[PDB]
RNA sequence: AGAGGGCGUGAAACCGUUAAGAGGUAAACGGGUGGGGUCCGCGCAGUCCGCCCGGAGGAUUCAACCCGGCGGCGGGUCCGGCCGUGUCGGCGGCCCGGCGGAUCUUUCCCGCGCGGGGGACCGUCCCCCGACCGGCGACCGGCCGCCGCCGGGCGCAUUUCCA
RNA sequence: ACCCACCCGACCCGUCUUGAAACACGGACCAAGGAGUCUAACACGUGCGCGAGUCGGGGGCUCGCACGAAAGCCGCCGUGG
RNA sequence: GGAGCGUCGGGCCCAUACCCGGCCGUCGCCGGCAGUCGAGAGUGGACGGGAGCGGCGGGGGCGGCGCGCGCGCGCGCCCGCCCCCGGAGCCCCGCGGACGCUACGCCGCGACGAGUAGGAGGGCCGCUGCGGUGAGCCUUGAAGCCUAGGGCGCGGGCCCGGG
């Protein structure tokens, strides 16, 4: 008899993508290979991200991709995003970029290409740079989802600012006993 | 002078008797078919000394000889002639079973074809 | 009983609602019937607009 | 797809995943939102702060369309018009400034979030913010009230 | 591609046949009857297939052109080899090796031809061997 | 192209074979030295006492540096403070053992697990027999048997420890690099005590097997190793 | 009728018999052997096949080679032409290229300041040839090399078949 | 795998229970039947499509529906959510 | 004259505990393999001038960074070469690459494996009906039923023989 807890012996990370789609799965076959045979950890990070959920690979807006490449020095590079590239209607002038993405929305595609931008697929990125050399690996804001505003220290727990799940906002949906001082108390 | 398989190792089995179901002996309503007991007290399900055994993955067969017939082959249930020609390039490792529901005319047609291709048949001398 | 976080929600299934469930298996059959009846009315008001006034 | 659901995997086991000390009885809490004050209170006042109690003024014959006032931010004002108004402008050389009827596009108020590009406009709208006005003037434009 | 359409097909094709813990595949120009990527007639730009001759004597090799698949009518190109066993193999060998065509296959293609030339063994001889037929 | 490369590859081949020879010779001389070192250590303890004894004097030799610690009772119903220390000595299973350098900290940790272990001061021979018969590396967290020095070197060679012999000298003299050589060794899975024990549950002093038995840990080692 | 008028199939409980085996700790059970039965696989030597080789017998045409024909592959000279990507030149399709636009013009036209259609303009999609480059499985034609098949040649120290 | 013998082991299951071989209940035997369903609402997770949008209903245009009470399309494409 | 009681020896007995080995599963390994040298790895390769037995004349270190299977060499004859795998013959081969590669595949190393309530995963486990699909099966006998017949699977179960 041995004393170990077998409690957290199984690591819960993903191995493959849970999706069954065939084009992504080909990318996975390609980046598994590169991951293992190259020294590049870029390939490993990319590989890891191909297995993740929709939630877990959030969309990267065009404006966010602009400003991250506006940063000093990462000039004449390629931005990479395992998610999708979306438009920003609240940005106007779009520099000529180099981009990798699993998806780019039709607007975002036009705007970039009109600028003299190049768009790449991930099979194309590999041939272009199999060890991820000269890349900017970005990500969309993970904690964008409105979901997260309900997460945390519960509402009605002093110093929480945590959206309650409520049928409809309005004068008479919550905001009585436990928010006003006038009505019982407040947190 | 029957069809020898490619490699005829010693199959070695961990357990030979069927695991039978608790109290299948006592009752005609209970069938031998294994069932794990889920009873709160249960001699068997809590592994007492002297009781019927519970199947585990412990008893598992060795992967080399799992599904290996005594003869050394694995079955493959052939359904008509066309379905045989698959085994053509195995023959030394898989044999052909012919199905129960196949007619005694075309049972014959299969058997002689397998005899050309040297695929061993596991129920040939039968329907007649 | 409520369990840890969720909309404290009021469904309106306390009356005998299954007595008054109204299915829509008609609707295709309906949609046609209107459409026939429509084409008939055109044909009756011969060169007059199908529209109406 | 019953095939996939949990009751298929519970077959054989006695309690059906509801335990055997305590069982699956009918309504052990009370039905629904029963006990909001008594015996379910803690859940109510740690996930629904402010359920109980009145507050504010009644309003008898509310009609929502009176208070209709959909807003738009400067952020994306140029979105309302075709790019070639914003292009034939930063060009032209008359110092023209194209009109943007915001009420046409379905917004009544113009509030002031965001940077407006240095490029004159005439914004026609039912209502404006203070800041939205200011930003518009700073671009070198003119806010315009409409009924 | 090859790989893309293998993704579509791997588990669903009419030609596949699971059952009895094995799997197989019945698509034409698959030597080895495997549901493999390698050994699949339909998928690959260049294909090998060694069937027996309809005569009953000999073997047919079945190359695939590259010229134009899209036009299956014209795509495969058959060729009977009805020669002295040892020769037959060598002709297949050269077809495969010295044309640099499907080099991966080739030994499988030889064994197939070999097994086919075994098939055309003698049925009467086999019957004599199994039973002694002496002194009733 | 061809004959130039071939000779370059043959040259490479040779330069390896030379180096292999060299490192082998180092190993051989390192042992020979350690043979002389242990000899010198043994005699020069006797030397001392005889010289005290010549005078009306005493030679109190050094208190021991290093001790082997065998877990001599099982893994049921064991107090949480004990249990923690037992898994700070890596003594998880029953009849696992470890070398342990002694000091005020370490000794007291053994004091808190006394009726759960048998321990004491191992011989030279004990350190050899344990290392050669049951010497297993921790090599990418896989218990792997020390079949060659290529294993020891690969892991401990950044300390000057390049062979089984070096390892034995680091363990036995409790060198600078003891912590790292001792942790490299996977804890010693010894069999049951042949000829049995005296009594599991009681201390050595009082007839049983537990606790410090100092010299006599070596007898126990032989009947278990 | 081993379908006989509540009759297709005809399970189990339960009963009758026939055969076999057992029998003072109620029976029944798990593990482990033994004995007996039932069938099943044999063998009237199972010495099991397959390569290659050496020898010994017997038998057909070759392979190796050229020659003629067919088919296939691969190649570069991209040689010649079709093919299409990125770029540049034609402002050439632009009206013989259409849609879209809160871009413009009511110098226009038609219908009643508005609607429809022109006409500018911008965005997008198509012709002409030249140049550079990815010469890309997107194809043809010749030439080359190699392979395979058929038929010609080769009659036997060869190449097969068989024992 | 059928029967018999012998050595060792071996209390009857289900269940509520801190505790069941219990002098705790249910159970003579066999067959068939027999219990976590569907709708609605919410939340989180996951998969797919599109993405500052998205959406399809409801309605309409296309057929006598064999398959169709489907499928397709809509300045309704967005009244509206 | 213990088979009693108190003190102590040797010796022997056996648990699912410990050790070694087999086999099954799970976990872990930034695990390996889409076809390459390489085992404390501590380089490889142009290419130009100047030359050659020269070399890089550094620690009782006991040594890793430098040395004795060659660097230049045997052949063509002091000068030239030091040549190509469609052929070095191979323990490593960078020219092309499994018998192996259903990449949801295949392979290797370690570790571990009680379980009610409860949770999750996988079931080429099982039932009935639908779209597809098996040039499936079936009066030369389907379903069901029965079977001291033959087997497979840890098991849910399954497949064959006979009736
Ligand atoms: Mg556990
Ligand atoms: Mg209990
Ligand atoms: Mg109307
Ligand atoms: Mg539950
Ligand atoms: Mg219950
Ligand atoms: Mg409860
Ligand atoms: Mg205890
Ligand atoms: Mg105690
Ligand atoms: Mg009848
Ligand atoms: Mg009847
Ligand atoms: Mg009937
Ligand atoms: Mg009798
Ligand atoms: Mg109760
Ligand atoms: Mg009680
Ligand atoms: Mg009980
Ligand atoms: Mg009692
Ligand atoms: Mg009761
Ligand atoms: Mg009763
Ligand atoms: Mg039933
Ligand atoms: Mg969701
Ligand atoms: Mg377990
Ligand atoms: Mg359970």
Q: How far apart are CA A92 and CA E124, in angstroms?
A: 87
For residues F223 and F193, the answer to whether their CB atoms sit within 8 Å is yes
Resolution value (Å, 1 decimal): 9.1
For residues B38 and B45, the answer to whether their CB atoms sit within 8 Å is yes
For residues F178 and F171, the answer to whether their CB atoms sit within 8 Å is yes
* Residues of chain D with a CB closer than 8 angstroms to some CB in chain A: 45-56, 75-76, 78-79, 86, 114, 117
Name, in order, each residue with C-beta under 8 angstroms of F164's C-beta and a sequence gap of 6 or more: F131, F132, F135, F146, F149, F152
Name, in order, each residue with C-beta under 8 angstroms of B60's C-beta and a sequence gap of 6 or more: B14
For residues F222 and F133, the answer to whether their CB atoms sit within 8 Å is no
Tell me the CA–C1' distance in angstroms for F20 and I84: 35
Q: Strand F117-120 vs strand F211-212: parallel, antiparallel, or unpaired?
A: parallel
Which residues lie at CB < 5 A from ion ligand 7? F 77
Strands in F117-120's sheet, in edge-to-edge order, are F188-189, F96-101, F66-71, F117-120, F211-212
* Spacing, Cα C38 to ligand 3 middle (Å): 10
Residue F40: helix, strand or coil by DSSP?
helix
For residue B82, list chain E residues with Cβ-Cβ distance below 8 A. Answer: 26
Q: How far apart are CA F155 and CA A145, in angstroms?
A: 47
Residues 5-24 of E with CB under 8 A from A: 7-8
| DSSP per residue, chain D | -GGGSHHHHHTT-SSTTS-SSS---S-SS-STTTTTTTTSHHHHHHHSTT-SS--S---TT--GGGG---EEEGGGSGGGS-HHHHHSSSSSSS----EEEHHHHT--EEE--SPPPSS--EEEESEE-HHHHHHHHHHT-EEEE--
Tell me the CA–C1' distance in angstroms for F162 and I56: 27
Question: Which three-class secondary structure string do you get for chain B?
Answer: CCCCCCCCCCCCCCCCCCCCCCCCCCCCCCCCCCCCCCCCCCCCCCCCCCCCCCCCHHHCCCCCCCCCCCCCCECCEECCHHHHCCHHHCCCCECEEECCCCCCCHHHHHHHHHHHHCCCECCCCCCC
Q: How far apart are CA A54 and CA E116, in angstroms?
A: 53
For residues A119 and A81, the answer to whether their CB atoms sit within 8 Å is no
Q: Which ligand number lies closest to the CA of residue F201?
A: 8
Per residue in A43-63, is it b (16+ CB within 10 Å) or e — as a string? Answer: bbbbbebbbeeeeebbbbbbb
* Residues of chain B with a CB closer than 8 angstroms to some CB in chain E: 1, 67, 74-77, 82-83, 85-89, 91, 94, 112, 115-118
CA dihedral for B97, B100, B104, B109, sign (positive or negative): negative
- Which of E115, E111, E75 has the alpha carbon at shortest distance from E93? E111
Q: How was this structure determined?
A: cryo-EM
Name, in order, each residue with C-beta under 8 angstroms of D23's C-beta and a sequence gap of 6 or more: D15
- Which of B41, B119, B35 has the alpha carbon at shortest distance from B81? B119
CA atoms within 13 A on the CB side of E135: 0
* Spacing, Cα F71 to ligand 1 middle (Å): 23
Q: How far apart are CA B22 and CA E108, in angstroms?
A: 52
Q: How far apart are CA B118 and CA F94, in angstroms?
A: 58
CB pairs below 8 Å between A and E: how many?
9
Nearest C-alpha in D relative to C1? D29
Q: Does A26 touch chain D (CB under 8 A)?
A: no
Q: Is the CB of F157 under 7 A from strand I?
A: yes
């Amino acid at each position: 008899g041995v004393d170990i807890r077998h409690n957290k012996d199984r690591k819960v990370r993903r191995k493959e993508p849970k999706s069954q789609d065939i084009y992504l799965r080909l990318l996975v076959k390609l980046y598994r290979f590169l991951a293992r045979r190259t020294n590049s950890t870029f390939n490993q990070v990319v590989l890891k991200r191909l297995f993740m959920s929709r939630t877990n690979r959030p969309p990267l807006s065009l404006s966010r991709m602009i400003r991250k490449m506006k940063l000093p020095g990462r000039e004449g590079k390629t931005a990479v995003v395992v998610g999708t590239i979306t438009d920003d209607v609240r940005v106007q002038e779009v520099p000529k970029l180099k981009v990798c993405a699993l998806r780019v929305s039709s607007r975002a595609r036009s705007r970039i290409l009109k600028a003299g931008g190049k768009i790449l697929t991930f099979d194309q990125l590999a041939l272009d740079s199999p060890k991820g050399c000269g890349t900017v690996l970005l990500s969309g804001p993970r904690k964008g989802r409105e979901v997260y505003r309900h997460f945390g220290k519960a509402p009605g727990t002093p110093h929480s600012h945590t959206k309650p799940y409520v049928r409809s906002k309005g004068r008479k949906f919550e905001r009585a006993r436990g928010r006003r001082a006038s009505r019982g108390y407040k947190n | 002078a029957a069809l020898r398989p490619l490699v005829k190792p010693k199959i070695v089995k961990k357990r030979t008797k069927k695991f039978i179901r608790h109290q299948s002996d006592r009752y005609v309503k209970i069938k031998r078919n294994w069932r794990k007991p889920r009873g709160i007290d249960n001699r068997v399900r809590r592994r007492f000394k002297g009781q019927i055994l519970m199947p585990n993955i412990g008893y598992g067969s060795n992967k080399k000889t799992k599904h290996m017939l005594p003869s050394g082959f694995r079955k493959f249930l052939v359904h008509n002639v066309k379905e045989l020609e698959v085994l053509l390039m195995c023959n030394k490792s898989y044999c052909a079973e012919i199905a129960h529901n196949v007619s005694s005319k075309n049972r014959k047609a299969i058997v002689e074809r397998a005899a050309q291709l040297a695929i061993r048949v596991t129920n040939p001398n039968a329907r007649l | 009983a409520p369990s840890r976080n969720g909309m404290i929600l009021k469904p309106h299934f306390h009356k005998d609602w299954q007595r008054r469930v109204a299915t829509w298996f008609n609707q295709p059959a309906r949609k046609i019937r209107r459409r026939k009846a429509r084409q008939a009315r055109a044909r009756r008001i011969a060169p007059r607009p199908a529209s109406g006034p | 797809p019953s095939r996939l659901r949990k009751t298929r995997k519970l077959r054989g086991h006695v309690s059906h995943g509801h335990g055997r000390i305590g069982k699956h009885r009918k309504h052990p809490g009370g039905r629904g939102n029963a006990g909001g004050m008594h015996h379910h209170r803690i859940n109510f006042d740690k996930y629904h702060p402010g359920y109980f109690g009145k507050v504010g003024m009644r309003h008898y014959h509310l009609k929502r369309n009176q208070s209709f006032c959909p807003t738009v931010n400067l952020d994306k004002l140029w979105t309302l018009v075709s790019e070639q108004t914003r292009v034939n402008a930063a060009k032209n050389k008359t110092g023209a400034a194209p009109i943007i009827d915001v009420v046409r596009s379905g917004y009544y108020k113009v509030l002031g979030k965001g940077k407006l590009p240095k490029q004159p406009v005439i914004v026609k709208a039912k209502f404006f913010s203070r800041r939205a006005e200011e930003k518009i003037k700073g671009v070198g434009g003119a806010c315009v009230l409409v009924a | 591609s090859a790989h893309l359409q293998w993704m579509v097909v791997r588990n669903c094709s009419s030609f596949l046949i699971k059952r009895n813990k094995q799997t197989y595949s019945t698509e034409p120009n698959n030597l080895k009857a495997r549901n493999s990527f390698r050994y699949n007639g339909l998928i690959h730009r260049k294909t090998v297939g060694v069937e027996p001759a309809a005569d009953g004597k000999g073997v047919v090799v079945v190359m695939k052109r590259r010229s134009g698949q899209r036009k299956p009518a014209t795509s495969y190109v058959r060729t009977t080899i009805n020669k002295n066993a040892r020769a037959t193999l060598s002709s297949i060998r050269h077809m495969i090796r010295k044309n640099k065509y499907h080099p991966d296959l080739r030994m499988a293609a030889i064994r197939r031809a070999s097994a086919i030339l075994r098939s055309q063994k003698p049925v009467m001889v086999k019957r004599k061997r199994t039973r002694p037929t002496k002194s009733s | 192209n061809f004959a130039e490369l071939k000779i370059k590859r043959l040259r490479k081949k040779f330069a390896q074979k030379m180096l292999r020879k060299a490192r082998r010779k180092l190993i051989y001389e390192k042992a020979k030295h350690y043979h002389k070192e242990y000899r010198q250590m043994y005699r020069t303890e006797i030397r001392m006492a005889r010289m005290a004894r010549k005078a009306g004097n005493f030679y109190v030799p050094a208190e021991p540096k290093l001790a082997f610690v065998i877990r001599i009772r099982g893994i049921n119903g064991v107090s949480p403070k004990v249990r923690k220390v037992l898994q700070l000595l890596r003594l998880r299973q029953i009849f696992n053992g470890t070398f342990v350098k002694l000091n005020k900290a370490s000794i007291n940790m053994l004091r808190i697990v006394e009726p759960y272990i048998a321990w004491g001061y191992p011989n030279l021979k004990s350190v050899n027999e344990l290392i050669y018969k049951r010497g297993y590396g921790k090599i990418n967290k896989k218990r792997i048997a020390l079949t060659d020095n290529a294993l020891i070197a690969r892991s401990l060679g950044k300390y000057g420890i390049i062979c089984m012999e070096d390892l034995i000298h680091e363990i036995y003299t409790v060198g600078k690099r003891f912590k790292e050589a001792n942790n490299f060794l996977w804890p010693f899975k010894l069999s049951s005590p042949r000829g049995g024990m005296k009594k599991k549950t009681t201390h050595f002093v009082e007839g049983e097997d537990a606790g410090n038995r100092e010299d006599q840990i070596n007898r126990l080692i032989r009947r278990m190793n």
